[PDB]
Structures are given as C-alpha cells and as structure tokens.
C-alpha cells in the first residue's frame, strides 16, 4: 500500500497552468499550480503539498489577446504578485524531488486534465529557465480527461467533478490553483473508488 | 448500454503509428493502424473494424537513421506495398465517420498508448493531405498508458498487457497493426473489467 507501489515508481504531481495562448513554445506562461499526493497506511490517495504562482511572461513571449480575454488575466497589473518562471518551477521541482525521495519513487509524472497541454507548457518553461535535473517524465502523463472518461463517463472537467459528487464553481475556473485542486481531488476519487470497489490491488478480486 | 452513452458521445478509435523520428511535423509517418470498437447489447466493448497501412514518406520528409534502426522499416523497399498519407487517412476517416453515424456518436476520440505522440503524427499527416472534416477530436485523447496506470498499476504497454493476462510477442512490437490490436484489447479489458466490478453504470454500485 505504498505510493511507490501504486504506479511502478511514479510520483504523481497534479499540475495546471494558465497561459497567453495555445503555443507552449512561443506563448507566455501566466499561472502554474502544483499538488503532490500521498498515501496513508491503508493505501488511500490524497493531496500532500500545494504550491501556486502567478508567473511573469518570459522575455520575448507572445500574448494572444483572445487568451487574455478568455482567462481574464492581465500580466501588466503590478499588484498580481508575479514571480519568474525560474522561481516558480525551481520551488515546484524542489518540493517534488523531496517527495520522490521520501516516498522511494524514482520519477514524477504529471497529472493534468488534457495533460499534454499542461505538460508542454511546464517543460517549455523549465527549458527556458535552464532548470537542471527535471524530476518529471519527458513524455508520460496521467490525463484526468481520459481517466474520468473511464470512471465517470465524462471528459469535461466540471461535468466530471459534478458527476463525481464534487462541487465546482464556474467563477474560479480560470484559476490554475482552483483547477489544480479540483483535478487532484477528482484524480484521488477515481484511484480510490477503483480500490474501494476491489479493483486494486489486483489480488483483491479473489479475496472474500 | 449503447456506445454513444459510454463516453458522452465520443467514438473511440484505437490508433498506432510507426515513424521515422520524434517530430510529427518534420518526420515521416511510415505505418498506421486503426481499430474501431463496438458495444454489444449488454454494453460490453469489443473490436469492430481493423485497418492497417504502410505509408510512403511525404515529399520533403526527414528520415532519422536511428528511428529506422529501431523500428526496422526500410521506406525504399518497393515490396512494402506503401500508400500515400491521403490514401491511408482518407480510408480511415471514411470508416470512422460511418461508425460514428451508425452508433449515434458525435465525434471520434483517439485511443493510443502515450496518445499524444500518435495523435500528433495522425493530425499532422491529415493536414499535409488536406483532408476534409477530420472526425477526430482536435486535442482530447484516451491514453492507455494512464488507464493502465489506473487499472493495472503499469504504464509500459508490454507489461500492462501481461499484467492484464494478455499475451505479448516482442518480436512484433514494431508493427503498428500489432501494437494497435494489443492496445485495443487492453483498452476493452480495462473498460470491461470496470463494468464487471460494478463501476459502470454509475447506478450499478447500489
């Protein structure tokens, strides 16, 4: 019932980002949140550490007007308390390496909703910041859209959360932190329900 | 218990590709396979139609030597019976639109192992070929690597298959068709076991 036993050594970290466009290479990263997970002694999955940052657009970044209109972010607001991509990711990576070591995992895997999008932005930013020893798997993810499709028959984040019996506040949907917390709770519910119903561990089906 | 009921109107199509590199935009697509699924009257998911193609590298495509050494494909072998991207994808889309209509779904979703990779090559090929009305969802996929992580505690395709009690012949692992059918059987087993254990329908638990 160890975390390192559950996903062959993968240390799941929930991530979500807000951006200034669809291109991870050319468009600014504006917000990022991260939530590590942990298992109790019974093997139940739950949130561990939570981090969140407003991010300053990198030098040379494009800002698509439509993206800003959609997510309501204004990068030029001096009161938004933004930090550099380096500062945000350096802190996220530090927390993630420590969790990996403490739990005996060997690598982090990003958990996200339509994960590739968030993955590409995080990797692009870590590249720009010249971050060393990125604890994240280069291409593997846990896409909660697919997972929710299987478990709940829904792929839209809000609908999936509702179908899971969770709350979901539309006014907070453009916040990386809010999205990340909802996504983490969803993911945990799905993994936990699977265990509860006797799908994990694999031995359970025959016992009792 | 209809297929259209299971994934909010999404029509899952299992896809796998073999390529000549890691870059979907610049590298050739060399093989593609597709397997549509169907649900019987009791709502059990299974393979329906199977398609498979050797693909001619598009004009101006890069061929990474390492990729050819890895997958063992020789694009210049005239006996490999290759077709153009247009030919392959046009036939797949045709079969997919037909399945979508018959089952009452809205759109297809790609099912693949580490789906983004296969998705990006398929989409880039569909673009190069100027295909009309791509039935696939522009960004949503069902990644069996993540599903096998949930269902089986394994993310490697071979190991996940074996953990699921499936056979897996490594000597065939570089065939898109082979990978696609194993992936399809894995996906079906995962959806099906979820149903059998009382996870679906949502009402079943009570």
Swiss-Prot record, chain B:
Changing residue 66 to A: Reduces enzyme activity. Abolishes enzyme activity. Changing residue 107 to A: Strongly reduces affinity for RNA. One of its GO terms (molecular function) is identical protein binding. Changing residue 143 to A: Nearly abolishes enzyme activity. One of its GO terms (cellular component) is cytosol. It holds the Pfam family RNase_T. Trims short 3' overhangs of a variety of RNA species, leaving a one or two nucleotide 3' overhang. Responsible for the end-turnover of tRNA: specifically removes the terminal AMP residue from uncharged tRNA (tRNA-C-C-A). Also appears to be involved in tRNA biosynthesis, especially in strains lacking other exoribonucleases. Belongs to the RNase T family. This is Ribonuclease T.
């Amino acid at each position: 019932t160890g975390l390192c036993d559950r996903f062959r050594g993968f240390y799941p970290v929930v991530i979500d980002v807000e951006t200034a466009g669809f291109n991870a290479k050319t468009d600014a990263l504006l917000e990022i949140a991260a939530i590590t997970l942990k298992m109790d002694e019974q093997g139940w999955l739950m949130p561990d550490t939570t981090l969140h940052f407003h991010v300053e657009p990198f030098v040379g970044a494009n800002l698509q007007p439509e993206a800003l209109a959609f997510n309501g972010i204004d990068p030029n607001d001096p009161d938004r308390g933004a930090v550099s991509e380096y500062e945000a990711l350096h802190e996220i990576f530090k927390v993630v390496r420590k969790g990996i070591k403490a739990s005996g995992c060997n690598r982090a895997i990003m958990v996200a909703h339509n994960a590739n999008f968030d993955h590409s932005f995080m990797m692009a930013a870590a590249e720009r910041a010249s971050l060393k020893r990125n604890p994240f798997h280069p291409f593997a993810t846990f896409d909660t859209a697919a997972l929710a499709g299987l478990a709940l028959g829904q792929t839209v984040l809000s609908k999936a959360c509702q179908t899971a019996g969770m709350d979901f506040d539309s006014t907070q949907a453009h916040s990386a932190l809010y999205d990340t917390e909802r996504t983490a709770v969803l993911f945990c519910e799905i993994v936990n329900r699977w265990k509860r119903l006797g799908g994990w561990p694999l031995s359970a089906a025959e016992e009792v």
